């Protein structure tokens, strides 16, 4: 034990350590030196009794590509404590509790515990100890706990627009410093107290970050954003404020994308649907709210889709076999080489037919379904599309398809390289055609006072068709089926597509409060709906206001 570095013995043979105590002249801790020599030098080493490493497997692991082509799930090395004792090197405050949601806040590396922030030293990772306790130099590991009055076990961290921003439930936060980052500089203070359940990482997207908020038993996904007028005040609008009861309260993923400008949230309380949220911003204002199922079948449990720039890659269950699946938002394209006609199938495969399938006795080529796929199917309507204009629909058998996967078409279809898919179910109801009127401010409010005798709503459409239309009164149930183009049009061909252009007028006869127009179709064919009108006698007796 020496009292300064200058008061130190000259030789002090090789296996020897001194606890240098503070000089009481600088603000210094009590570092150790450990002559090592072969070379007359006093270094700085670890404490004598304190131990260097963490349990070192319980720490977070990683997978590396390493260039054989196959991965390997390894522990990574953790740099041992060696600059002093305990506690001039305290144990970093995750050493009793669990870690989660690793930062990248600097060229430091950060951990989260409840309630702890554990940043590394700069410019090298996995060294959560100071380089030397001769002094606090700079760039030390950072242990700031939290600055709140309510229990916040401290989950996901997401960055946007100024900061990293470290979401517990019921607290959001601000992670800054006053100037540069030291261990004494980090701010770590509150922003809001919106409630966020922590099972899905809150995704993207542009300037906003989208929550997932817990209720019972219908989640209430918000939209977190910086307000316009203040510099550093944030707000979290609900974007399910008008669709509250819709998402079944278990959220394991928020997929999202930025190119096609939509958020999309999977759920696990009803796993067969991918919810959508299509939006766009013009002049810093919202102009489109949207919420929609995508439905893939009766029992098709959907694992988490993720979206490379304009391609949605989906993983599904059946529950016979799982499979990857691509959704491509390409407009006027061809999926598989050898179309007509992009075919909007659900679950296209260009399956060429092998040599031995045909028998000339019963005049039937037959296809075994998992010889196309490798999967057995629960339900759905398998449609089969030829490079010619042929389409056959098959309409799954009772206790199919697993009982008899057999796809019986025609006589001789061997070299035809045929297309096999499903049908999507496209459904779109309308709101009941009231008198929408935007007055007195905006916020378009109806007027339901007199009887609106409704007649012949009309739907106009761009370059596609063959949606039906179902008009559903209390007891009427009329169906206004529609096909592609008008007679004599250049679009209507004896073989090409049948697409057509609007409008289309069709009677919706009756009261407004009772007629529910909706559009189911099926199909292997697109549609477009641009606008919808309606006319009708209106007579309010009591001349209002």
């Amino acid at each position: 034990y020496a009292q300064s570095f200058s008061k130190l013995p000259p030789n002090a043979p090789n296996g020897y350590m001194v606890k240098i105590v503070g000089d009481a002249s600088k603000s210094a801790d009590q570092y150790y030196v450990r002559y090592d020599a072969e070379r007359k030098v006093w270094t700085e080493t670890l404490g004598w009794n304190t131990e260097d490493q963490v349990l070192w497997e319980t720490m977070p692991h990683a997978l590396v590509r390493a260039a054989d082509g196959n991965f390997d799930f390894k522990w990574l090395e953790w740099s041992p404590k060696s600059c002093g004792d305990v506690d001039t090197n305290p144990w970093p405050s995750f050493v009793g509790s669990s870690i989660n949601d690793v930062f990248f806040f600097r060229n430091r590396l950060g951990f989260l515990s409840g309630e702890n922030i554990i940043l590394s030293r700069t410019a090298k990772y996995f060294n959560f100890y100071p380089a030397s306790i001769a002094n606090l130099s700079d760039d030390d590991p950072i242990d700031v706990a939290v600055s709140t009055n309510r229990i916040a076990i401290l989950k996901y961290a997401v960055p946007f627009s100024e900061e990293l921003l470290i979401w517990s439930d019921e607290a959001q936060f601000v992670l800054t410093a006053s100037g540069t980052l030291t261990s004494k500089s980090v701010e770590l203070n509150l922003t809001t107290q919106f409630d966020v359940q922590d099972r899905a990482r809150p995704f993207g997207i542009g300037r906003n970050v989208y929550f997932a908020s817990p209720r019972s038993s219908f989640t209430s996904i918000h939209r977190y954003y910086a307000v316009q007028d203040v510099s550093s005040v944030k707000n979290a609008e609900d974007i399910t404020s008008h669709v509250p009861n819709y998402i079944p309260n278990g959220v394991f993923s928020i997929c999202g994308s930025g190119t096609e400008n939509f958020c999309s949230v999977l759920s696990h309380g009803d796993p067969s649907k991918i919810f959508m949220y299509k939006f766009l911003y013009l002049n810093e204002e919202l102009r489109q709210q949207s919420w929609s199922h995508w439905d893939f079948g009766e029992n098709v449990q959907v694992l988490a889709c993720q979206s490379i720039s304009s391609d949605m890659y989906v993983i599904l269950r059946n529950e016979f076999n799982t499979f990857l699946a691509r959704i491509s938002f390409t407009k006027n394209a061809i999926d598989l080489q050898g179309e007509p006609y992009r075919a909007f199938m659900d679950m296209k495969i260009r399956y060429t037919i092998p040599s031995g399938t045909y028998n000339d006795d019963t005049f039937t080529t037959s296809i075994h379904i998992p010889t196309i796929y490798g999967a057995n199917f629960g339900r759905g309507k398998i449609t089969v599309l030829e490079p010619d204009g042929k389409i056959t629909v098959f309409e799954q058998p009772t206790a199919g398809w697993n009982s008899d996967p057999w796809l019986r078409l025609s006589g001789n279809l061997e070299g035809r390289m045929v297309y096999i898919g499903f049908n999507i179910n496209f459904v779109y109801e309308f709101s009941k055609f009231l008198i929408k009127q935007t007055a007195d401010d905006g916020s378009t409010s109806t007027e339901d006072i007199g009887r609106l005798q409704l007649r012949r709503a009309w739907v106009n459409y761009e370059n596609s068709g063959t949606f039906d239309i179902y008009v559903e009164n209390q007891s009427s149930n009329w169906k206004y089926t529609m096909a592609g183009a008008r007679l004599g049009s250049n679009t209507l061909r004896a073989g090409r597509l049948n697409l057509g252009t609007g409008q289309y007028r069709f009677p919706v006869v009756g009261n407004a409060k009772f007629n529910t127009v909706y559009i189911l179709s099926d199909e292997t064919t697109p549609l477009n709906i641009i606008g919808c009108g309606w006319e009708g006698n209106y007579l309010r007796r009591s001349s209002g206001i």
Partner: protein
Amino acid sequence: LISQSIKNLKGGISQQPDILRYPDQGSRQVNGWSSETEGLQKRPPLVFLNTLGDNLGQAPYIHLINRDEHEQYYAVFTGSGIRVFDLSGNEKQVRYPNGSNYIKTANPRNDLRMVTVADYTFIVNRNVVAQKNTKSVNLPNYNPN
């Protein structure tokens, strides 16, 4: 006799009652794609590339890796262990040179995390707690006298 046209159809569900809600808002909508210029469309289909399974982890944690244009893989964190597909759908091998002992979890969605950069792909269990190990000390006793 009155009439009015709803110019757009964007869009979606509105479970608010119909005398309150805006136009453009239907009461249900399945497989629709309310674009900006075109209105309602069918969602584009699922191509098959290709298949990988029998009903993989029963409920897994799946998180991709997107490094380059030629370098785009998955990571499926099942209840048993790590499984990796590419973006063409065939399996690629992972190895456990140090034992798994970290992915075996009843709920890998609620308990596993993955933070991913181009240099490292961190995998975080939330159930496990990290301790110091008493085996490796600097000096065993060292009475400093």
